[PDB]
Amino acid sequence: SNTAQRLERLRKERQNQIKCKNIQWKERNSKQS
Amino acid sequence: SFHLLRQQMSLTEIMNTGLQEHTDDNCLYCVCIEILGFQPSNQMCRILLRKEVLRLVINLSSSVSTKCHETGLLTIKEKYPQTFDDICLYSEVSHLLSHCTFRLPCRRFIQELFQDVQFLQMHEEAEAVLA
Amino acid sequence: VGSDPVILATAGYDHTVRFWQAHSGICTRTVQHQDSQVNALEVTPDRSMIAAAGYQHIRMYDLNSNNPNPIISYDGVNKNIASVGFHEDGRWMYTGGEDCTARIWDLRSRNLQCQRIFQVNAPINCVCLHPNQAELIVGDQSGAIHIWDLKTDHNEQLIPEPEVSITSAHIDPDASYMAAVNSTGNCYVWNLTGGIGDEVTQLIPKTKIPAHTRYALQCRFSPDSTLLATCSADQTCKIWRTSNFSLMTELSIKSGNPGESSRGWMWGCAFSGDSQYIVTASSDNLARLWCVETGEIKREYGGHQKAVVCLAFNDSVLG
Ligand SMILES: [Zn+2]
DSSP states (O other), rough: HHEEEEEEEHHHHHHHSSEEEOOOOOOOOOOOO | OHHHHTTOOHHHHOOOOSSOOOTTOTTTTGGGGTTTTOOOOOOOHHHHHHHHHHHHOOOOOOOOSSHHHHHHHHHHHHHHHTTGHHHHHHHHHHHHHHHHHOOOHHHHTTTTTTTSSSHHHHHHHHHHHHH | OOOOSEEEEEEETEEEEEOOOOOOOOOOOEEEOSSOOEEEEEETSSSEEEEEEEESOOEEEEEESSSOOOSEEEOOOOOOOOEEEETTTTOOOOOEEEEEEEEEEEEETTTHHHHOEEESSOEEEEEOOTTTSSSSEETTTTTTTTEESSSSEEEEOOOOOOOOOOOEEEEEETOEEEEEETTTEEEEEEEEOOHHHHHHHOOOEEEEEEEOOOOOOOOOTTTTEEEEEEETTEEEEEEEEEEOOOOOEEEEEHHHHHHHHSSSOEEEEEEEEEEEEEEEEESSSSSEEETTOOEEEEEEEOOOSSOEEEEEEEESSOH
C-alpha cells in the first residue's frame, strides 16, 4: 500500500546510515581530579 | 504523565498498564472474559513503547507537524515490529479515533500499520469456547 | 590507499578532497565531503587515518581501505574549527574552534574523561603544540597569544600589539625559536622556554622581520629547524633562515599582468623530510611543488575545480 512502501523504503537507508561513528561532546571532565 | 516527561528526555535515554483509557468494557478481547469466558491476556521494556506510540497518536490529531509524527511511528514499527501485535493496544487506538478527530490521510495512516497482524490470543480463545 | 612512504592531500571549496603522490601527478583517490568546506587537515601519527574539520563537525576518513564516507564524525561544537592536531603518541586530539573554546578530545572509547576546556574572550585562529607535548599555544583575533600549560591550569597572556588579529603560530621541532604572524604581515619571533626541567615558560622578544605588506596567512617551521616559510595574501611566499633571519629564497606566483588583479591568494605551505622540496596550495584551484634552491617549480597538480585552502604533507621520519 502507501505506507507499506514507505516502511520498506525507510529501511533501505537505515542499512547505509549505520556505517558512521558519531561521538558527541558530553559536558564532563576530571574536574575533581 | 508520560507526555510531559517525554519533552525533556529521549526514547533511548529512558531505557538506559501503559494504556490509559483501558477499562473492561471497551476492549475487543477484555470484554469477552466474563460474557464469553476467555482467558486473561499475557505479556518493563514493552510498557514504555505503548506510551510512546500513544502520545504520537494524540500529537497527530492537531496536524500541526504531520511529517514529524508520521516519521516517529514508522521507526518504531521497524526497530520494534512486534509492538503492533497486541489486541489491547489496537483497542485503545480504535477508542481514541472515535472521540478525537483526524484528517482522512492521517486517519488512513493509522489502522493501516495493523494490517499485517495475527491476533493469536483472540483466535485461541474463540476456538476453545466455541468447540 | 595510504600504504606509501609519502602521501599528499588537498581540499577546498570543491567539496572533495584529492589524494596525491609526489612521484607522479595522478590522483590516487577522490573522497567526498558534502555541505562543508575544509579549514585544515592533518594525519594521525599512526599514518592510518586522516582528520578533516569544518563547520561544526570533524569528519574522519580511512587510508588503508577505500571508503569515501566519514566513518568517524564528531559533533557538539556550534561554530567552525580553526585547526586540529594530535599527540605524538596519538592519545588525545586538540581542536581550536571559532566559538572561543580551545578543547582537547580523547581518542579512547572509554570513560577516561581526559578532555579539558579553555575559554577565551575572542575567537581563535591558530592552535600550536609544544614539541615536548606539555605546553600549548592559543591565538585569538585580539592579537593576544595565550601560552597554555597542560601540567597546570593557568595560562600566560602575551600580546605584542592590539587591534590586529593573528593567523598562525608554530614551534620548530628542535625547540629553538617560536614565530607567529598577524593580519598586517609582521612576523614576530620569540625565544621559547629554556627551562626544560620544570617548564618555566619564559619568553623574550628576539626579532621582528618587516615583510608581507598584505595579509599574512600561515607561517611554519621545518623539521631541521633551519628554515621558516611564511605565507601571505600578495601571492608571494618568503623562506627565512634561522642564522640572521635574512631572505633565503623568495617565491611568487604573480603572472605580471595587471588584468588578473590578485587572481588567487597563497594559503598553506609544507616541508618535506629533508627540508629540500616544499608543497604549496594556493587559491587558484591548483597546487604546486617548489624547490628551496632553484626557485623554479618541480611539479604541478590541477585536479581540483575550486580553490584549495588546506593541504597535508608528511613522509618518513628518516631523510
Ligand atoms: Zn484489553
